[PDB]
Amino acid sequence: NNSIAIPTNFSISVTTEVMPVSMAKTSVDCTMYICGDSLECSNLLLQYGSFCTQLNRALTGIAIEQDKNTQEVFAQVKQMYKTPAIKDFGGFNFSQILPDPSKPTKRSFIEDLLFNKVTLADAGFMKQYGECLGDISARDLICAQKFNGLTVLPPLLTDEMIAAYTAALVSGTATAGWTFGAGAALQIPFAMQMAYRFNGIGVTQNVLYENQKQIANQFNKAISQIQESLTTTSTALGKLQDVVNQNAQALNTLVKQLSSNFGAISSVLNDILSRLDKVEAEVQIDRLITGRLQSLQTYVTQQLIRAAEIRASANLAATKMSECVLGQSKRVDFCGKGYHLMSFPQAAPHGVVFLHVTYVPSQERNFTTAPAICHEGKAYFPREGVFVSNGTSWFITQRNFYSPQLITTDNTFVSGNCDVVIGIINNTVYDPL
């Protein structure tokens, strides 16, 4: 009841958080999947048009939402601030996250390492169609998907176009600070910006202005550790890989389900047509049509559920983009485990990666504390911070960092007597004369 713990040193930590944003857009065709190139099957399929317009409308509604998610997350500001020529903002080495004019692409180095982590084994919008005339070793699943009417539409925004947004946001938060999100861009040196960000934590303004070199060295070391850690582990980006694998597995299962005859005498329709007259062959064909329609319905329902989950994740990512990159708030553990809530966005294949910069106290030392002091019969409560004893004398200091200070009248305020409080001590209060 009379001991406190006040930290004497701190550290700057950079943590990575990966969030999926969008998934693949898939378009289906009822023709050349259910019936193929067969006029007799297509004649019987004309009575099920309403069962196909629903599937097409649902898939288009999914695809528009997938295109809208990337619009919502990344394009928060409509002003494309060009990147600065320099990369050192008061000792802060930003060259690892901003693009440099010495490479064919316009992505940063960390973005290149992120893009090399995700393997796009599945295809649909980069594989040529004329490549699908290969040998027995070229009988792959993608050519079967293209031959069975299952197509993958490309996304609207190019990755190099996403890189322009992320470079504009990083340049704006490096130069203007938090001002360009609320209103116009207001230039300010980075040191006072970081002093203001320290002021929103509870740490006084002097600490950065005394230890900015050590803080910059810790920041550079943290970015270098992130760079080194993003080249070895293959499980850091497992969420986007899981999304891609789920989409590919769903498409491959939809292709492989065509081998079921659904109670008919054969699975393929050609021998149904060539072995029997059409009087009972239409009875045979109806079962296959019903089974393939059921398979399409199941695939569309699962895609809708996955799209809803991706929409929820994208809404969370957009909220984190708005509240942690464009500004700093006081929500606990919203973006990173720590006090400082400043973040940097980077692009990733169908996703975003946030780098959170957090302030953590490290070195600890115990102390004796008192609630208030009674000088001349009146209690003197501290205006901010707590009262601390060195072991032989008393000071006032803030809770988040140990900076001892002499107890004066400006550090405290008077309220009432000193007989209603429990555990008050007696000392002297400095008054300038």
Partner 1 sequence: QSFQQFGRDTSDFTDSVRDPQTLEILDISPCSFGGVSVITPGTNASSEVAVLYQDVNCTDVPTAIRADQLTPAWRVYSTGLNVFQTQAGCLIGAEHVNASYECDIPIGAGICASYHTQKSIVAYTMSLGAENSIAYA
Ligand X SMILES: *[C@@H]1O[C@H](CO)[C@@H](O)[C@H](O)[C@H]1NC(C)=O
Ligand Y SMILES: *[C@@H]1O[C@H](CO)[C@@H](O[C@@H]2O[C@H](CO)[C@@H](O)[C@H](O)[C@H]2NC(C)=O)[C@H](O)[C@H]1NC(C)=O
Can you give the binding site for partner 1, defined by CB under 8 A? Answer: 27, 29, 31-32, 36-37, 67, 75, 77-82, 84, 125-130, 133, 136, 139, 141, 144, 146-149, 151, 153-158, 161, 164-165, 171-172, 175-176, 185, 187, 189, 255-256, 258-259, 267-268, 270
Amino acid present at 49: G
CA angle in degrees (0–180, nearest 5) for 239-240-244: 120
As a whole number of angstroms, the distance between CA 98 and CA 109 comes to 8
Binds 98, which of partner 1, ligand X, ligand Y, none (CB < 5 to 8 A, cut-off by type)?
A: none
HSE-CB of 268 using CA atoms within 13 angstroms: 5
- What's the closest the beta carbon of residue 109 comes to ligand Y, in angstroms? 5
44 burial via Cβ count (<10 Å: 0-12, 13-18, 19+): middle
- What's the closest the beta carbon of residue 340 comes to ligand Y, in angstroms? 16
Amino acid present at 351: G
Binds 159, which of ligand X, partner 1, its own copies, none (CB < 5 to 8 A, cut-off by type)?
A: none
C-beta of 183 vs 377, nearer to ligand Y: 183
As a whole number of angstroms, the distance between CA 349 and CA 153 comes to 15
As a whole number of angstroms, the distance between CA 339 and CA 289 comes to 60
Site for ligand X in 86-145 (CB under 6 A): 130
- What's the closest the beta carbon of residue 121 comes to its own copies, in angstroms? 19
Helices (H), ranges, 206-277: 206-229, 238-256, 270-275
C-beta of 183 vs 391, nearer to ligand X: 391
- What's the closest the beta carbon of residue 161 comes to ligand X, in angstroms? 19
Binds 364, which of ligand Y, ligand X, partner 1, none (CB < 5 to 8 A, cut-off by type)?
A: ligand X
**Residue 277 CB neighbours (<10 A):** 8
What string marks each residue from 218 to 257 as x (binds ligand X by CB under 6 A) or -? ----------------------------------------
- What's the closest the beta carbon of residue 227 comes to ligand Y, in angstroms? 6
Q: Does position 365 bind ligand X by CB under 6 A?
A: yes
# binding residues, ligand X (CB under 6 A): 11
Q: Does position 183 bind ligand X by CB under 6 A?
A: no
Binds 284, which of its own copies, partner 1, ligand Y, none (CB < 5 to 8 A, cut-off by type)?
A: none
Paired strand residues for 182: none
Query: Given candidates 112, 242, 364, 384, which one binds ligand X under the rule CB under 6 A?
Result: 364
228 burial via Cβ count (<10 Å: 0-12, 13-18, 19+): exposed
Q: 387-418: b or e for each residue (b if 16 or more CB lie within 10 Å)? A: bbbeeeebbbbbbbbbbeeebeeebbeeeeeb
C-beta of 79 vs 393, nearer to partner 1: 79
As a whole number of angstroms, the distance between CA 372 and CA 91 comes to 42
C-beta of 16 vs 217, nearer to ligand X: 217
322 burial via Cβ count (<10 Å: 0-12, 13-18, 19+): middle
- What's the closest the beta carbon of residue 277 comes to its own copies, in angstroms? 11
Q: Where on the chain is the footprint of ligand Y (CB under 6 A)? A: 9, 11, 87-88, 93, 95-96, 109, 214, 217-218, 224, 227, 363
- What's the closest the beta carbon of residue 371 comes to partner 1, in angstroms? 47
Question: The tokens 């003197």 sit on which residue?
Answer: 380
- What does the binding site for ligand X look like in residue numbers (CB under 6 A)? 1, 130, 364-366, 390-393, 422-423
